[PDB]
Design a protein around this nucleic acid. Structure first.
Lengths: 114, 66, 79, 95, 177
RNA sequence: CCAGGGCUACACACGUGCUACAAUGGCGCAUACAAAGAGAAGCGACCUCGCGAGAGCAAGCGGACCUCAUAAAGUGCGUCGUAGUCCGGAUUGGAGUCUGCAACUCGACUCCAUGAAGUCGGAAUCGCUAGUAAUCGUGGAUCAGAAUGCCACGGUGAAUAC
RNA sequence: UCCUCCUAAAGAGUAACGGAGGAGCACGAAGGUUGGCUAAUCCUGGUCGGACAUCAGGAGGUUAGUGCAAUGGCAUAAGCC
């Protein structure tokens, strides 16, 4: 019960507990586990270390917690250093995809100042 | 070394995922069956992907096709 | 994000590149085509993209070939 | 109490905005506790006209006053609203 | 003790071939490895230092020494003589079975393990590193711990300069950049 | 007249909506029943390809015929065990599709990843008397593309009025 | 009233409504003895942890400390267990 650095979800089901890794949702976890041949509705307390070892090398191809946290930072380091439009929205805490900023803009700002 | 003040220090065996038996004396439960050791970890193989991943022209040449 | 077949560049800028790269480095290219992509043929030249009221000079570096010309030309000035 | 000042053909200055809120601080405590205000200033080629819509715990009350130089219009508007606020207050006391 | 004789039959020849030593005893020997866990929050609750001292009794094999405040500084709301931290010094043979517990079964288990820093040397040739959570070591079971703190590890040796301290640990294959 | 920009700017204030905060539910599989309307530079089967948005080939149809077009909630089974959770789908990164000369400013959609606030809401306030309220899906006009709006259509279906 | 320094003129003492400060206690260990120990402050390195907490090392040599003022002392420690 130790996958890709922490991964300690006890008595959760198989495809559900694997999504605790930063780097996998429910689609990849049912794709990762089908590549190793384990039934997807079984709790990981049932799984033995002779079955957990097939999970460790399968999750090593899709990038996870260690480097996935920094590859998405490599892009935002690149855009803020170049000075594009999305870089300055990243540089000022504003929305990037062209959403409304007159009224809401609020999950990007955070709280409200006054 | 002083008596009845320290916890018990038993001699354990540690077997890994990549098949290496390790013999340390430590302060664990029944036995040790760890995950990662000095072997089978990418701290001597997997550090080659930190800087040699970028570039924008190598992304562009598969859109060119001319 | 889009335009699955072929990057887009305008002819009044594309032919203005191949008359300005074999003849040496030239003037800041006063262009209005923000709609055009950065190709690798213009790496290292000065381009003057129009942002609405002036022409901001941008030096085309090696790594901006995935973007377009107008993304390095901010339009609205805030504070 | 939240002010909402708005002008139709009268672009509000900074001296006029504080002149509204200092006057609307009067008809504040001295007459009734209120929720929300909408102030509308208008110039119609002669009449500096000022409207106001107060929201109170019972309902709403509106007053309008056309005046001389947009300062006497708001000075007549508050006296129109203060009398409607005392009439509404004693309607909700009935001791 | 499994690596103590490994000190005795390779690196006394390896360091002498690198540093052209005439005498044997001028090679760097390792005296002690000290494990400091400066708690700090003992002014709010006295009881949290006790389970902080249980982690040091679990990582090493011996009871730690609770260290008191030296002076009385008002910036951290302390007076002198107050229990503020816990250390444990490992010497002899117990420091060796901890050291190959550290370099083999422990430092691969830290999150995002890149090359460990090499410029962290004291200026005289002693190594000093810090880990950020207790669950690197498998003695802490991630089921009975109450809060996650960190601790410092200092490996002091008889090296005279810093690059002899880098040479001794890398001869034990210490992870570096 | 033309290009480029702006109408999409954001310390903020307010109005109208949508999605929610879950177990009367979420998800997976099986599966039952609608009305109304649009269609010729248009609607576009079936058959292939792609995880998908879609692409290729391409009949049929100026339409009680053909196409859009699986109605969904419901029901059967299984799972989740009350947790910011298999609730929530915001934000952002990567990779894609379609439209159009051109989706940088500033489109829609799909895929993978990321999983924010939110645990039923202060003072105050709104709509509704029966196929109504409340929920569920569908269609249209505008339109190359671009609705949580608007205008229509049906499904389930209350409580209460001294 | 008492204590400390200066005035006080290198023994003691020495005045002024001269210049500065303190005391009207504390302690059953903060007393006795034996045994052991040696600071301040900076510098480098180190989880949260910084100008400053704890750790390691170096520089330093009593600039610390003394139950409470000041002077005289104190390493054989009178300082710390």
């Amino acid at each position: 019960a130790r996958i890709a650095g922490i991964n300690i979800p006890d008595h959760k089901h198989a495809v559900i507990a694997l999504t605790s890794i930063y780097g996998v949702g429910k689609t990849r976890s049912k794709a990762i586990l089908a590549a190793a041949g384990i039934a997807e509705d079984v709790k990981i307390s049932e799984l033995s270390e002779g079955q957990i070892d097939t999970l460790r090398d399968e999750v090593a191809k899709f990038v996870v917690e260690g480097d996935l946290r920094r590859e998405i930072s490599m892009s935002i380091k690149r855009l803020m250093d170049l000075g594009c439009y999305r870089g300055l929205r990243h540089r000022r805490g504003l929305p990037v995809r062209g959403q409304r900023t007159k009224t809401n803009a609020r999950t990007r700002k955070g709280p409200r100042k006054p | 070394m002083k008596k009845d003040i320290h916890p018990k220090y038993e001699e354990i065996t540690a077997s890994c995922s990549c098949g290496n038996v390790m013999k340390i004396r430590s302060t664990v439960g029944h036995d040790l069956n760890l995950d990662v050791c000095s072997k089978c970890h990418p701290f001597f193989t997997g550090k080659q992907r930190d800087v040699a991943t970028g570039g924008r022209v190598d992304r562009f040449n598969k859109r060119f096709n001319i | 994000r889009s335009l699955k077949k072929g990057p887009f560049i305008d002819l009044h800028l594309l032919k203005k590149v191949e008359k300005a790269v074999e003849s040496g480095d030239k003037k800041p290219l006063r262009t209005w085509s923000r709609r055009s992509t950065i190709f690798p043929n213009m790496i290292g030249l000065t381009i003057a993209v129009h942002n609405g009221r002036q022409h901001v000079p941008v030096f085309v570096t090696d790594e901006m070939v995935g973007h377009k010309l107008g993304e390095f030309a901010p339009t609205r000035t805030y504070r | 109490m939240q002010l909402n000042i708005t002008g139709n053909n009268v672009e509000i200055t900074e001296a006029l905005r504080e002149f509204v809120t200092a006057k609307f601080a009067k008809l504040e405590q001295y007459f009734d506790r209120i929720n929300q205000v909408y102030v509308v200033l208008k110039v119609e080629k002669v009449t500096h006209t000022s409207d106001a819509t107060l929201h109170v715990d019972g309902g709403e009350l509106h007053a309008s006053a056309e005046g001389q130089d947009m300062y006497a219009a708001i000075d007549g508007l508050i006296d129109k609203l203060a009398r409607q606020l005392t009439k509404h207050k004693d309607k909700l006391k009935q001791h | 003790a499994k690596l103590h004789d490994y000190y005795k039959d390779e690196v006394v020849k390896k360091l002498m071939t690198e540093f052209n030593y005439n005498s044997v005893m001028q090679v760097p020997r390792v005296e002690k490895i000290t494990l400091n866990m400066g708690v700090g929050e003992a002014i709010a609750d006295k009881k949290l230092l006790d389970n902080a001292a249980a982690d040091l009794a679990a990582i090493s094999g011996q009871k730690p020494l609770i260290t008191k405040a030296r002076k009385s500084v008002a910036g951290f709301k302390i007076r002198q003589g107050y229990p503020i931290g816990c250390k444990v010094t490992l010497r002899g043979e117990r420091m060796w079975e901890f050291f190959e517990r550290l370099i083999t079964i422990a430092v691969p288990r830290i999150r995002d393990f890149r090359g460990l820093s090499a410029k962290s040397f004291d200026g005289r040739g002693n190594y000093s590193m810090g880990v950020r959570e207790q669950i690197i070591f498998p003695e802490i079971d991630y089921d009975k711990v109450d809060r996650v703190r960190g601790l410092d590890i200092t490996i002091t040796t008889t090296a005279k300069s810093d690059e002899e301290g880098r040479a001794l640990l890398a001869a034990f294959d210490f992870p570096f950049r």
